[PDB]
Amino acid sequence: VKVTQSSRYLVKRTGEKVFLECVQDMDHENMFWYRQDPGLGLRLIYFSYDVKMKEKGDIPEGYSVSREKKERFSLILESASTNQTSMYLCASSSTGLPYGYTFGSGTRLTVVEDLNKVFPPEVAVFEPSEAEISHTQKATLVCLATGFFPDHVELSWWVNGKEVHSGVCTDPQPLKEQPALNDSRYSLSSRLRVSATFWQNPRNHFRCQVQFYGLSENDEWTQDRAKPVTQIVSAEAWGRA
Amino acid sequence: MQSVTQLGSHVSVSEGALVLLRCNYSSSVPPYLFWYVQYPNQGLQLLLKYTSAATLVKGINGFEAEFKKSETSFHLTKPSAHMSDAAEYFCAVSESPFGNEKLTFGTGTRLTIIPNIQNPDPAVYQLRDSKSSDKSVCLFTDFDSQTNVSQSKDSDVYITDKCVLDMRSMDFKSNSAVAWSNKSDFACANAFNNSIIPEDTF
């Protein structure tokens, strides 16, 4: 009772033809592909009400679809443009059951006019200001993630091997490292706040983790530098007296 | 199930205040309506649905909506907003009583909740972790939500907007923005600048 999409992000070049799959284990007759854009909510591209059937949504232009088996629903972009840059959402449902839609969990796709522009993030951590600690008896560590294109990162915090959610804020949007360049690179920051005693106890471990999603192994380059593949870049710091 | 609109793509309300998210529909046939919420990181999830089973529908996370046929509306409300309500919200409509057959969504309302900072001691602080290379971040923190951080002017200096962290176990929340540059003539004590409080400590 899950609907799974094939990849959670993907990167592709202008003019290329793109294939996303969706799959579901509930024996559902109905499957739908939407896309999601800020300001525009969800817009239905295509749907299918049985194996081999298809029907245009409100915005099929540029797309084509393929329902081969009862379990699969593929969406196909005839030729990538930057207005197909979006979050793609699959959903499935049953004609008979009274349960409605089950949604997949997205695939973000970004389309660029030049594959050489994608980079991982370098991840630094900054340790608290001594002056905060004394004035408040708390301790804010800051993480920067920098030098990433495209904006595909997922930043988490880890404290003695267990991830944490209390005491954290991350920028909802990153800022543009270079605000003129059309395909400018990106930076993101987060914060982790803890009582200063926690910070003043070198038995405690903190790590800033930044999962990036770039090129898949199939993609093709040879610039001298590492192939910018999906990866986790961390940084860390220990407690301090 | 013909169409839907959500007037107000962005609502910001104080923690504890009334939440109201608009939804209006047109339908040539009998409509069935649905509200979905999408939390920052995760996917879409049913908050509530209307079926011709009663007028005032009650849903998850403390929400409610009224199906008012005489205005073509199904507005989402919650009397007292919680930090954890921050999310994007979508109204949909279907011709099927269960939402099996195609849903038409509206355009979304982004909900932002404004923390009530209790005892603010605003300050700018210098952090440098001594791995020290192309390094010096400045933290402006513990300010009141009255205060907004304005963008950069020197285009080679970076400020991030304010963010809100909550140390649940100490029923304590606090706002912060970060600023940084590699430039040698750059100082925390003159890095932030705008809509800024005199009592800022250093």
Contacts of B146 (CB under 8 A, 6+ apart): none
Set of chain B residues whose Cβ sits within 8 Å of the Cβ of A103 = 43-45
A194 and B165: CB-CB below 8 Å? no
Q: Does A191 touch chain B (CB under 8 A)?
A: yes
Tokens of B184: 């040698």
Which of B178, B182, B199, B200 is best to mutate for the A interface (most A CBs within 10 A)?
A: B178
Tokens of A25: 């284990």
Closest CA to A174 of A201, A155, A195: A155
Phi-psi region of A62 (alpha: psi -120 to 50; beta: other; left: phi over 0): left
Pick from A113, A136, A170: which residue ends a domain? A113
Task: Measure CA of the first residue to CA of the last residue in chain B; give whole Å.
Answer: 58
Set of chain A residues whose Cβ sits within 8 Å of the Cβ of B22 = none
What secondary structure, in 3-state letters, does B58-98 show?
ECHHHCEEEEECCCCEEEEEECCCCHHHCEEEEEEEECCCC
**Three-class SS state of A135:** helix
Contacts of A27 (CB under 8 A, 6+ apart): A70, A71, A94
Q: Domain spanning B116-201 has what CATH number?
A: 2.60.40.10
Q: Give the closest-approach CA distance of B100 to chain A in angstroms.
A: 5
Q: What is the spatial distance between Cα A48 and Cα A52, in angstroms, rounded to a whole number?
A: 8
Q: Give the closest-approach CA distance of A220 to chain B in angstroms.
A: 30
Which of B45, B170, B176 is facing A169, going by the closest CB pair? Answer: B176
Q: Does A1 touch chain B (CB under 8 A)?
A: no
Q: Give the closest-approach CA distance of B181 to chain A in angstroms.
A: 11
Q: Does A125 touch chain B (CB under 8 A)?
A: yes
Burial, A221: exposed, middle or buried (Cβ in 10 Å; 0-12, 13-18, 19+)? Answer: exposed
* Same domain? A127 vs A101: no
Whether A185 contacts A177, CB under 8 Å: yes
Domain span at residue A229 reads: 114-241
Among the CATH numbers 2.60.40.10, 3.40.50.720, 3.30.230.10, 3.30.70.2660, which is that of B1-115?
2.60.40.10
Query: ∠A233-A81-A103 over CA atoms, to 5°?
Result: 65
* Same domain? A78 vs A128: no
Q: How distant, in Å, are the alpha carbons of A130, A183, A224, B107, B202 from that of A134? A: 7, 43, 47, 47, 12
The total of other beta-carbon atoms located within 10 Å of residue A92's CB is 24
Burial, B35: exposed, middle or buried (Cβ in 10 Å; 0-12, 13-18, 19+)? Answer: buried
* Same domain? A12 vs A96: yes
* Same domain? A84 vs A18: yes
* Same domain? A75 vs A179: no
Q: What is the spatial distance between Cα A62 and Cα A15, in angstroms, rounded to a whole number?
A: 11
Residue that has been written with the tokens 């908050």 in this structure: B47
Q: Does A158 touch chain B (CB under 8 A)?
A: no
Q: Does A47 touch chain B (CB under 8 A)?
A: yes
Which of B1, B25, B133, B163 is best to mutate for the A interface (most A CBs within 10 A)?
A: B163
Method: X-ray
